[PDB]
Design a protein around this ligand. Structure first.
Ligand SMILES: *[C@@H]1O[C@H](CO)[C@@H](O[C@@H]2O[C@H](CO)[C@@H](O[C@@H]3O[C@H](CO)[C@@H](O)[C@H](O[C@H]4O[C@H](CO)[C@@H](O)[C@H](O)[C@@H]4O)[C@@H]3O)[C@H](O)[C@H]2NC(C)=O)[C@H](O)[C@H]1NC(C)=O
Ligand SMILES: *[C@@H]1O[C@H](CO)[C@@H](O[C@@H]2O[C@H](CO)[C@@H](O[C@@H]3O[C@H](CO)[C@@H](O)[C@H](O)[C@@H]3O)[C@H](O)[C@H]2NC(C)=O)[C@H](O)[C@H]1NC(C)=O
Ligand SMILES: *[C@@H]1O[C@H](CO)[C@@H](O[C@@H]2O[C@H](CO)[C@@H](O[C@@H]3O[C@H](CO)[C@@H](O)[C@H](O)[C@@H]3O)[C@H](O)[C@H]2NC(C)=O)[C@H](O)[C@H]1NC(C)=O
Ligand SMILES: *[C@@H]1O[C@H](CO)[C@@H](O[C@@H]2O[C@H](CO)[C@@H](O)[C@H](O)[C@H]2NC(C)=O)[C@H](O)[C@H]1NC(C)=O
Ligand SMILES: *[C@@H]1O[C@H](CO)[C@@H](O[C@@H]2O[C@H](CO)[C@@H](O)[C@H](O)[C@H]2NC(C)=O)[C@H](O)[C@H]1NC(C)=O
Ligand SMILES: *[C@@H]1O[C@H](CO)[C@@H](O[C@@H]2O[C@H](CO)[C@@H](O)[C@H](O)[C@H]2NC(C)=O)[C@H](O)[C@H]1NC(C)=O
Ligand SMILES: *[C@@H]1O[C@H](CO)[C@@H](O[C@@H]2O[C@H](CO)[C@@H](O)[C@H](O)[C@H]2NC(C)=O)[C@H](O)[C@H]1NC(C)=O
Ligand SMILES: *[C@@H]1O[C@H](CO)[C@@H](O[C@@H]2O[C@H](CO)[C@@H](O)[C@H](O)[C@H]2NC(C)=O)[C@H](O)[C@H]1NC(C)=O
Ligand SMILES: *[C@@H]1O[C@H](CO)[C@@H](O[C@@H]2O[C@H](CO)[C@@H](O)[C@H](O)[C@H]2NC(C)=O)[C@H](O)[C@H]1NC(C)=O
Ligand SMILES: *[C@@H]1O[C@H](CO)[C@@H](O[C@@H]2O[C@H](CO)[C@@H](O)[C@H](O)[C@H]2NC(C)=O)[C@H](O)[C@H]1NC(C)=O
Ligand SMILES: *[C@@H]1O[C@H](CO)[C@@H](O[C@@H]2O[C@H](CO)[C@@H](O)[C@H](O)[C@H]2NC(C)=O)[C@H](O)[C@H]1NC(C)=O
Ligand SMILES: *[C@@H]1O[C@H](CO)[C@@H](O[C@@H]2O[C@H](CO)[C@@H](O)[C@H](O)[C@H]2NC(C)=O)[C@H](O)[C@H]1NC(C)=O
Ligand SMILES: *[C@@H]1O[C@H](CO)[C@@H](O[C@@H]2O[C@H](CO)[C@@H](O)[C@H](O)[C@H]2NC(C)=O)[C@H](O)[C@H]1NC(C)=O
Ligand code: NAG
Ligand code: NAG
Ligand code: NAG
Ligand code: NAG
Ligand code: NAG
Ligand code: NAG
Ligand code: NAG
Ligand code: NAG
Ligand code: NAG
Ligand code: NAG
Ligand code: NAG
Ligand code: NAG
Lengths: 147, 449, 147, 147, 52
């Protein structure tokens, strides 16, 4: 079931992982409400300057929405999994990062309070993702070619 | 049959669309060339190699009477003039009282008037007497005698900058990415319905923006015969577009010689006016050859009769009223604005069976109001020296009278004032389409689990 | 053989499926004729305003060409096939959508008249594509990992 | 080891192929120094025009950096290898293109002087890449499906 | 009787009083896809190779 944009914000990590295509298409293709910026046929002079001063403020939010989108899509290409909305990266979950056990996480926690606990360690979890992919692409695949 | 969807991206299909195109003018160095209002800060240098990829088997429906390229060309033309004339000097001091008089001592039929007025020197507390030579169309009477300009009530006459240049320069209309323009190549295309020969084009050919009435100058020619072209032919209020296969030449001149004064207005802003007639007073005129004009009407009558009847009588009258913009033939040549009397061309009957040129008298005025906007007017500075022009006539804009009588005598008159007939007679073979890349089709492929 | 842009518009579905890279690169990289917008060295004042009023109309067609391109490239990532110009999606062709049989389609029909018949059903054909991929990514692949 | 942006410009082709993610993320996500273009709260009138004349010159370098990036990322999708920072394209190295033998290239040459020798032949090396992929995607994969 | 030096040709624009002209260090930066290279050779007369 699709509840609309952000509808699974209060559900569990287990029950909100059904709805990942909603916050992806409304992260870019909610811009269909902004393509009206090709306005109606304007009249003569007298506020020809007001037409372009407010034209940039409409276009900074168009360009800024695009070039914050690509750098988070590219980062999945560094880790080895581009395109896929679910990928698996083969990096061992160090037990100093977090806690309990696998099963009280997906059943009675939400993603918001989960993001709080693991935000403190996110720059070191992103550090091992670009290292277990580089070891595979330049070492393993060119060795399993010739051998 | 048990089949499975496959997905194809890049498939050559279209939908009709509406968009805003690229100005795309031609360009050179222009290191000493004066800023030119038609291009400059609007256009980008042109792809030097258009590729006309001829399509096979494609048959598309065009319509020149609902096109948007004509409807936005008329909007850009107003916006190209209205954005260039922001910096230009206003002629607000010249709304004063003029002590004028005749120029000649013996009246035969006068044209110019010789005036006198006050004008500020450098220091703006001292006043001096200055004169000029205004045409009589641009001067009206208040009550020895005392005159004034034609529009001191409502309008602010903005003097067109002297560093400017208005001139036909070919604009190429281009489509941005995701859009394409389609060109008809059928030689019998009257303007609607299917075109069995279509080819995609990046950018159209270079049309030369010339603003004229009753006659289409420096246009594009036909291919085999004369092409008569209208919307609802039996409707009177619709204009009749005529297009020639061979150009009809014209020769125009202003045979009197003039110079320029330099009457200043303010610090850094001067004003140009007419100073002296160095020579002799002569009327400006235009020549059309007669044996070429009488044969070019031998074709327009021939294919009018396929729309009305063989045994009919086709006549040409001249006009029935209006302003100078729609009773006469307007130009824009050499920097001045000519309004020639064309009651000598459109005058003949047709009954279904060398070097002598037709002279056309011609008026001149220098305070024009184009598109008749409320309280706005322009001014053209005088050109130093005599003016010479050569042009071709490729087409007419007729109109049909049609009251309810029983006679077998049609009468066709030239028509004027709507600029969309100048542009719709050139961009008729085009249509903009959209390119939709995704598509689905059944096959036997099966993702392989 | 490459006939140029849209040259295979009158060919069959069979003979025009050779030319798919042409309408893809000229859907974006026909913008090379627009990068001239970095103009020549402008002169002084007197039309400094005309330089920027016509600057936005050049840039709305640059930005609008980019952000209509990404949302049709992303949609292939929802269906499970990103990158590929030909993918196969494992959704059964319901015989109420269309007609004859497999072989009068690829031999004597064009894509334009084919698009007419199937345009009426395109929003329900796009509906099953995002469902036969979600069943594979979250259910099958995480079960075939642990089993 | 990561020496920063372009740090491996003087190293070998062998030792500088360790650092490919550096010149990729700083080809786009060096724009984080340009997102300051959402400026401080401006005052009243008197230079309201100067605020937008210099606004376009900031935004042409934002848009031009984006739409030169996508057409070089798309070109990897034509060759059959999208996402991967190292792919292998199965096109035979014609021995008229270049020279010595495989082993004096990766040990004592840099990429800059390597790019000089092979720049003269780059448009014909890019010609075979889109042909050994088209033969695989439309011919081989639809034959190995049904057989 | 005197007058100013340029009443013939020029419009003398009074510089606003709320203005301030003053040297303030401008840093020239390159946008993405571009880079700037700095020489560090101490004998660089202005042309030719810079070995650092
Ligand atoms: C229909 O098309 C014809 C064919 O092009 C066109 O005729 C052209 O008219 C222009 C008018 O500007 C001519 O250009 C002038 O030609 C003369 C020839 O001696 C030159 O002296 C001119 O140079 C001056 O240009 C400016 C005028 O003040 C000055 O700034 C400059 O310093 C020079 O003094 C100018 O080049 C052009 O030559 C003709 N073309 C031909 C082939 O003769 C006609 O105008 C078009 N019809 C209409 C109504 O526009
Ligand atoms: C410009 O050319 C087009 C096509 O060459 C002309 O369109 C044609 O208009 C006639 C009008 O009588 C159509 O004929 C009528 O067809 C209907 C059925 O469609 C029928 O009920 C009538 O009895 C009559 O036969 C004709 O079909 C149509 N051509 C096509 C291909 O559809 C158009 O008239 C031309 N314009 C002018 C001003 O002549
Ligand atoms: C600034 O420094 C540069 C380099 O340090 C100087 O360039 C040098 O210019 C001399 C000019 O005589 C060159 O010598 C000539 O070489 C040619 C062959 O290239 C030869 O035919 C002549 O007989 C002469 O030997 C010298 O090669 C060149 N340096 C390099 C490295 O190429 C430059 O002159 C200096 N500027 C000034 C104003 O001194
Ligand atoms: C228009 O499309 C047809 C496809 O129906 C193209 O191929 C022709 O097809 C018919 C019937 O299958 C054959 O009889 C012809 O011999 C085919 N043409 C050739 C050149 O072999 C046809 O080529 C397309 N039109 C053009 C002008 O190329
Ligand atoms: C200057 O020329 C004009 C134009 O011909 C003369 O205008 C005449 O004005 C009177 C005044 O009512 C009219 O009755 C005439 O019909 C006008 N035309 C002619 C030909 O006389 C005017 O007379 C001339 N100026 C002087 C001082 O005589
Ligand atoms: C227009 O009128 C002015 C004066 O109103 C004429 O200028 C005079 O010309 C005579 C030549 O015989 C000089 O002696 C005067 O000094 C001039 N006056 C001024 C104020 O300069 C001018 O000639 C007239 N123009 C025409 C074409 O008749
Ligand atoms: C400005 O407008 C007035 C009003 O039209 C003009 O004066 C004349 O006024 C009477 C009565 O209002 C009208 O019957 C006349 O037709 C008017 N004359 C003209 C020539 O329009 C006055 O002339 C106008 N001034 C200008 C410079 O056009
Ligand atoms: C129009 O008038 C000007 C003068 O105002 C004429 O230019 C003169 O031409 C003669 C003959 O070549 C030269 O001796 C003079 O030096 C010129 N004067 C200037 C100020 O340049 C011009 O020739 C006239 N035009 C025509 C067609 O007669
Ligand atoms: C318009 O003017 C041109 C000159 O610019 C005329 O062309 C000349 O015509 C005569 C007579 O046929 C020839 O002897 C000349 O050789 C022509 N000039 C050139 C340069 O070829 C033309 O005849 C005029 N047209 C009209 C209708 O009067
Ligand atoms: C051509 O148009 C002119 C005006 O545009 C007509 O001229 C009028 O002719 C009548 C004679 O029937 C005169 O009484 C009027 O005074 C004229 N009008 C003007 C303004 O002078 C003319 O009738 C039209 N037809 C022909 C064949 O010349
Ligand atoms: C346009 O030209 C025609 C002639 O070519 C003008 O008609 C003349 O009008 C005057 C006014 O009464 C008459 O004296 C002439 O006899 C007419 N000529 C002919 C041949 O009949 C016409 O008036 C001009 N247009 C305008 C607006 O004046
Ligand atoms: C105006 O018409 C003339 C006559 O067609 C054009 O001049 C050239 O005339 C020769 C006749 O010997 C033709 O063969 C050429 O095709 C004509 N054009 C060119 C470009 O040489 C003249 O070009 C026309 N004016 C415009 C602006 O096109
Ligand atoms: C404005 O320009 C005039 C013209 O140069 C100046 O007046 C003097 O004019 C004579 C003859 O034209 C020259 O020989 C003198 O050199 C001029 N004097 C000067 C100081 O240039 C006039 O002074 C100028 N006014 C201003 C405010 O600069
Ligand atoms: C887990 O994390 C701690 C601190 O973040 C680190 O010291 C340790 O090496 C990590 N790895 C293990 C225990 O395998
Ligand atoms: C997980 O840990 C909690 C508390 O640390 C414990 O109560 C539970 O039995 C553990 N095992 C599970 C959920 O299998
Ligand atoms: C986050 O990091 C800070 C700084 O070390 C630390 O004080 C805090 O306890 C951390 N919180 C969690 C939930 O790890
Ligand atoms: C033009 O030529 C035709 C046919 O030679 C002739 O009847 C007619 O009188 C001529 N003149 C005009 C003005 O139509
Ligand atoms: C009119 O003339 C044309 C010329 O061929 C002819 O085809 C047509 O039948 C004629 N019409 C009448 C009503 O005579
Ligand atoms: C109009 O036609 C008549 C009759 O042919 C002719 O006498 C007259 O001169 C023409 N008018 C003009 C202005 O040439
Ligand atoms: C095919 O489509 C029809 C209507 O679109 C639908 O009712 C039916 O369930 C579909 N599937 C089949 C027949 O398998
Ligand atoms: C496909 O259907 C058409 C008409 O429905 C039939 O003529 C033909 O024999 C069928 N089979 C094929 C093309 O194998
Ligand atoms: C398209 O849908 C409309 C609305 O149901 C229907 O009337 C029409 O027949 C359909 N056309 C095709 C080709 O399926
Ligand atoms: C290698 O290149 C040359 C010239 O570029 C070409 O003639 C030849 O066919 C190529 N292939 C070989 C020798 O296999
Ligand atoms: C490669 O070629 C060079 C010179 O052409 C030669 O000296 C060397 O022995 C060759 N073989 C290698 C490096 O295995
Ligand atoms: C590059 O191409 C030019 C033109 O053929 C040729 O003269 C030159 O030798 C070539 N250089 C290399 C290194 O192949």
């Amino acid at each position: 079931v699709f509840l609309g944009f952000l509808g699974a914000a209060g559900s569990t990590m287990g029950a909100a992982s059904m709805t990942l295509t909603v916050q992806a298409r409304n992260l870019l293709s909610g811009i269909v409400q902004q393509q009206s910026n090709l306005l109606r046929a304007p009249e003569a002079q007298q506020h020809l300057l007001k037409l372009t001063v407010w034209g940039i403020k409409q276009l900074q939010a168009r360009v800024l929405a695009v070039e914050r989108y690509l750098r988070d899509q590219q980062l999945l290409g560094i880790w080895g999994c581009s395109g896929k909305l679910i990928c698996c990266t083969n990096v061992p979950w160090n037990s100093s990062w977090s806690n309990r056990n696998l099963s009280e996480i997906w059943d009675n926690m939400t993603w918001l309070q989960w993001d709080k606990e693991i935000s403190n360690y996110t720059q070191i979890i992103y550090g091992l993702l670009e290292e277990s992919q580089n070891q595979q692409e330049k070492n393993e695949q060119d060795l399993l070619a010739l051998d | 049959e048990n089949l499975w969807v496959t997905v194809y991206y890049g498939v050559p299909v279209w939908k009709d669309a509406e968009t805003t195109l690229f100005c795309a003018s031609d360009a050179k160095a222009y290191e000493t060339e004066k800023h030119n209002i038609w291009a400059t800060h609007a256009c980008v240098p042109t792809d030097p190699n258009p590729q006309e990829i001829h399509l096979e088997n494609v048959t598309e429906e065009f319509n020149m009477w609902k096109n948007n390229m004509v409807e936005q060309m008329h909007t850009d033309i107003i916006s190209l003039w209205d954005q260039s004339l922001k910096p230009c000097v206003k002629l607000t001091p010249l709304c004063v009282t003029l002590q004028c008089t005749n120029v000649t001592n013996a009246i035969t039929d006068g044209e110019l008037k010789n005036c006198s007025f006050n004008m500020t020197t450098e220091l703006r507390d001292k006043k001096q007497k200055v004169y000029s030579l205004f045409y009589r169309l641009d001067v009206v009477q208040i009550n020895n005698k005392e005159y004034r300009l034609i529009n001191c009530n409502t309008s602010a006459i903005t003097m067109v900058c002297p560093k400017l240049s208005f001139e036909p320069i070919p604009i190429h209309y281009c489509a941005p990415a995701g859009f394409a323009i389609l060109k008809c190549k059928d030689k019998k295309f009257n303007g609607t319905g299917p075109c069995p020969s279509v080819s995609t084009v990046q950018c159209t050919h270079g049309i030369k923006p010339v603003l004229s009435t009753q006659l289409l100058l420096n246009g594009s020619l036909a291919e085999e015969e004369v092409m008569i072209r209208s919307e609802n032919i039996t409707n009177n209020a619709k204009n009749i577009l005529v297009q020639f296969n061979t150009p009809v030449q014209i020769n125009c001149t202003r045979p009197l010689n003039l110079t320029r004064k330099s009457i200043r207005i303010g610090p850094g802003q001067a004003f140009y006016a007419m100073g002296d007639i160095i020579g002799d007073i002569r009327q400006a005129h235009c020549n059309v050859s007669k044996a070429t004009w009488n044969e070019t009407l031998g074709k327009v009558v021939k294919q009018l009769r396929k729309h009305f009847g063989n045994n009919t009588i086709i006549r040409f009258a001249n006009s029935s009223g209006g302003d100078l913009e729609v009773t006469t033939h307007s130009f824009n040549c050499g920097g001045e604005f000519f309004y020639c009397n064309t009651s000598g061309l459109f005058n003949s009957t047709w009954i279904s069976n060398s070097n002598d040129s037709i002279t056309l008298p011609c008026r001149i005025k220098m305070i024009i109001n184009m598109w008749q906007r409320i309280g706005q007017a322009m001014y053209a500075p005088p050109i130093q020296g005599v003016i010479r022009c050569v042009s071709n006539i490729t087409g007419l804009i007729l109109t049909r009278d049609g009251g309810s009588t029983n006679s077998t005598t049609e009468t066709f008159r030239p028509g004027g004032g709507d600029m969309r007939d100048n542009w719709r007679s050139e961009l008729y073979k085009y249509k903009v389409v959209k390119i939709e890349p995704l598509g689905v089709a059944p096959t036997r492929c099966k993702r392989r689990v």
